[PDB]
Design an enzyme around this catalytic site. Structure first.
Site, PDB file in Angstrom:
ATOM      1  N   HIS A   1     -12.978   0.175 -19.809  1.00  0.00           N
ATOM      2  CA  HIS A   1     -13.303  -1.193 -20.298  1.00  0.00           C
ATOM      3  C   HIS A   1     -14.394  -1.700 -19.356  1.00  0.00           C
ATOM      4  O   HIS A   1     -15.321  -2.351 -19.480  1.00  0.00           O
ATOM      5  CB  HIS A   1     -12.300  -2.208 -20.452  1.00  0.00           C
ATOM      6  CG  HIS A   1     -11.420  -2.502 -19.106  1.00  0.00           C
ATOM      7  ND1 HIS A   1     -10.287  -1.935 -18.938  1.00  0.00           N
ATOM      8  CD2 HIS A   1     -11.571  -3.357 -18.301  1.00  0.00           C
ATOM      9  CE1 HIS A   1      -9.703  -2.341 -18.204  1.00  0.00           C
ATOM     10  NE2 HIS A   1     -10.345  -3.218 -17.362  1.00  0.00           N
TER      11      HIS A   1
ATOM     12  N   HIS B   1     -16.238  -5.955 -10.103  1.00  0.00           N
ATOM     13  CA  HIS B   1     -16.487  -5.263 -11.349  1.00  0.00           C
ATOM     14  C   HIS B   1     -17.469  -6.329 -12.077  1.00  0.00           C
ATOM     15  O   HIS B   1     -17.708  -7.360 -11.490  1.00  0.00           O
ATOM     16  CB  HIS B   1     -15.007  -4.969 -12.370  1.00  0.00           C
ATOM     17  CG  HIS B   1     -14.578  -6.057 -12.849  1.00  0.00           C
ATOM     18  ND1 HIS B   1     -13.411  -6.669 -12.224  1.00  0.00           N
ATOM     19  CD2 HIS B   1     -14.974  -6.960 -13.982  1.00  0.00           C
ATOM     20  CE1 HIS B   1     -13.255  -7.597 -12.704  1.00  0.00           C
ATOM     21  NE2 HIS B   1     -14.027  -8.021 -13.905  1.00  0.00           N
TER      22      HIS B   1
ATOM     23  N   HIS C   1     -19.423  -7.240 -16.122  1.00  0.00           N
ATOM     24  CA  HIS C   1     -19.415  -7.178 -17.571  1.00  0.00           C
ATOM     25  C   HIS C   1     -20.894  -7.129 -17.837  1.00  0.00           C
ATOM     26  O   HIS C   1     -21.792  -7.903 -17.130  1.00  0.00           O
ATOM     27  CB  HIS C   1     -18.851  -8.592 -18.195  1.00  0.00           C
ATOM     28  CG  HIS C   1     -17.704  -8.567 -17.607  1.00  0.00           C
ATOM     29  ND1 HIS C   1     -16.251  -8.132 -18.534  1.00  0.00           N
ATOM     30  CD2 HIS C   1     -16.796  -9.221 -16.512  1.00  0.00           C
ATOM     31  CE1 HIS C   1     -15.607  -8.317 -17.892  1.00  0.00           C
ATOM     32  NE2 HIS C   1     -15.611  -8.841 -16.696  1.00  0.00           N
TER      33      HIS C   1
ATOM     34  N   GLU D   1     -20.271 -13.383 -19.171  1.00  0.00           N
ATOM     35  CA  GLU D   1     -18.977 -14.236 -19.798  1.00  0.00           C
ATOM     36  C   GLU D   1     -19.388 -15.753 -19.890  1.00  0.00           C
ATOM     37  O   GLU D   1     -19.242 -16.369 -21.070  1.00  0.00           O
ATOM     38  CB  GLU D   1     -17.833 -13.748 -19.241  1.00  0.00           C
ATOM     39  CG  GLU D   1     -17.664 -11.900 -19.113  1.00  0.00           C
ATOM     40  CD  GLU D   1     -16.110 -11.711 -18.877  1.00  0.00           C
ATOM     41  OE1 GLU D   1     -15.429 -11.760 -18.039  1.00  0.00           O
ATOM     42  OE2 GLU D   1     -15.901 -11.117 -20.085  1.00  0.00           O
TER      43      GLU D   1
ATOM     44  N   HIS E   1     -17.832  -9.925 -10.907  1.00  0.00           N
ATOM     45  CA  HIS E   1     -16.575 -10.536 -10.530  1.00  0.00           C
ATOM     46  C   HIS E   1     -15.865 -10.053  -9.496  1.00  0.00           C
ATOM     47  O   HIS E   1     -15.555  -8.829  -9.249  1.00  0.00           O
ATOM     48  CB  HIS E   1     -15.548 -10.844 -11.872  1.00  0.00           C
ATOM     49  CG  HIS E   1     -15.888 -11.356 -13.095  1.00  0.00           C
ATOM     50  ND1 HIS E   1     -15.270 -11.018 -14.132  1.00  0.00           N
ATOM     51  CD2 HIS E   1     -16.802 -12.536 -12.965  1.00  0.00           C
ATOM     52  CE1 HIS E   1     -16.154 -11.887 -14.962  1.00  0.00           C
ATOM     53  NE2 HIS E   1     -16.613 -12.930 -14.540  1.00  0.00           N
TER      54      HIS E   1
ATOM     55  N   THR F   1     -10.167 -12.420 -17.723  1.00  0.00           N
ATOM     56  CA  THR F   1     -11.046 -12.575 -18.997  1.00  0.00           C
ATOM     57  C   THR F   1     -10.640 -11.236 -19.930  1.00  0.00           C
ATOM     58  O   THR F   1     -11.282 -10.781 -20.845  1.00  0.00           O
ATOM     59  CB  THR F   1     -12.586 -12.714 -18.821  1.00  0.00           C
ATOM     60  OG1 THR F   1     -12.898 -11.673 -18.041  1.00  0.00           O
ATOM     61  CG2 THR F   1     -12.868 -14.270 -18.209  1.00  0.00           C
ATOM     62  N   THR F   2      -9.546 -10.495 -19.366  1.00  0.00           N
ATOM     63  CA  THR F   2      -9.316  -9.084 -20.072  1.00  0.00           C
ATOM     64  C   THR F   2      -7.791  -9.158 -20.068  1.00  0.00           C
ATOM     65  O   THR F   2      -7.178  -9.984 -19.018  1.00  0.00           O
ATOM     66  CB  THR F   2      -9.506  -8.007 -19.598  1.00  0.00           C
ATOM     67  OG1 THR F   2      -9.082  -7.780 -18.116  1.00  0.00           O
ATOM     68  CG2 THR F   2     -11.234  -7.541 -19.534  1.00  0.00           C
TER      69      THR F   2
HETATM   70 ZN   LIG Z   1     -14.379  -9.612 -15.057  1.00  0.00          ZN
END
Ligand SMILES: [Zn+2]
Length: 256
Positions: A61, A91, A93, A103, A116, A195-196
């Site tokens: 992911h 990590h 996005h 995000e 993040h 957020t996941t």
């Molecule tokens: Zn994140």
């Protein structure tokens, strides 16, 4: 299981994680004119000189840079926080195109990527216990725009080849997170969630105003990652972001 596809995308997550439509969900849109200036807000304190990176991994992911969090080595304090938070991993996005990827959005503006830096409150002793508390985590968000190259980021770009598919990992020592910070530590803060999945509502968001610039070529390499495991049909890891969620009464405060 969940992903970012048509069939298992963010709009489907509520089915397995009912908290998906909770009261303090993240990411959100930061309306600069509605955000409240709070003078009682202390400056951020980022202590990353003794950080110890261990490795990088493709979890299917995103890609994570893991750090040794057995001692107060890389810590975040001050700001809206009470106590010491330890860096555990970082990590990003990103998107399929430069016009999307972040995000959080600023006045509805989408950035190329979003970094993040995830930290946990030491009083809870471990990550696993921290995720069970309202004040358990602290995530530092940093926006990436496409411009000039970020020297500090190249170490990460060069290793991606090595963790192409889901489940791969590689040793990754002596990575200094300090090479990823913007010049200013001015920020916005609000209470939210991961957020996941499990989308647990344990996060104190700290979103930096000033974005960091990355080159076209650097973000291009992110886009070469795969969601899929090795020996499976190839699914490029792009657009691994969740859409903005309702503020629902919450207030976003500004340090500036
Ligand atoms: Zn994140």
């Amino acid at each position: 299981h969940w992903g970012y596809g048509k069939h298992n995308g963010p709009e489907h997550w509520h089915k397995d994680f009912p908290i998906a439509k909770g009261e303090r969900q993240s990411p959100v849109d930061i309306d600069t004119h509605t955000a409240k200036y709070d003078p009682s807000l202390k400056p951020l304190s980022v202590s990353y000189d003794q950080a110890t990176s261990l490795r990088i991994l493709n979890n299917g992911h995103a890609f994570n840079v893991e750090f040794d969090d057995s001692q107060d080595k890389a810590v975040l304090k001050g700001g809206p926080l009470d106590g010491t938070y330890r860096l555990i991993q970082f990590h990003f996005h990103w998107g399929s195109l430069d016009g999307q990827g972040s995000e959080h959005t600023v006045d509805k503006k989408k950035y190329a990527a979003e970094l993040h830096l995830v930290h946990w409150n030491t009083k809870y002793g471990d990550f696993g216990k921290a995720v069970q508390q309202p004040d358990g985590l602290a995530v530092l968000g940093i926006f990436l725009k496409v411009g000039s190259a970020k020297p500090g980021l190249q170490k990460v770009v060069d290793v991606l080849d090595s963790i192409k598919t889901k489940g791969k990992s590689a040793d990754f020592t002596n990575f200094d997170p300090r090479g990823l910070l913007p010049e200013s530590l001015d920020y916005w803060t609000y209470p939210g969630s991961h957020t996941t999945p499990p989308l647990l509502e344990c996060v104190t968001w700290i979103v930096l105003k000033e974005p960091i610039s990355v080159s076209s070529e650097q973000v291009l390499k992110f886009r070469k990652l795969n969601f899929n495991g090795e020996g499976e049909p190839e699914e490029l890891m792009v657009d691994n972001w969740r859409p903005a969620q309702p503020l629902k009464n919450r207030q976003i405060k500004a340090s500036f």
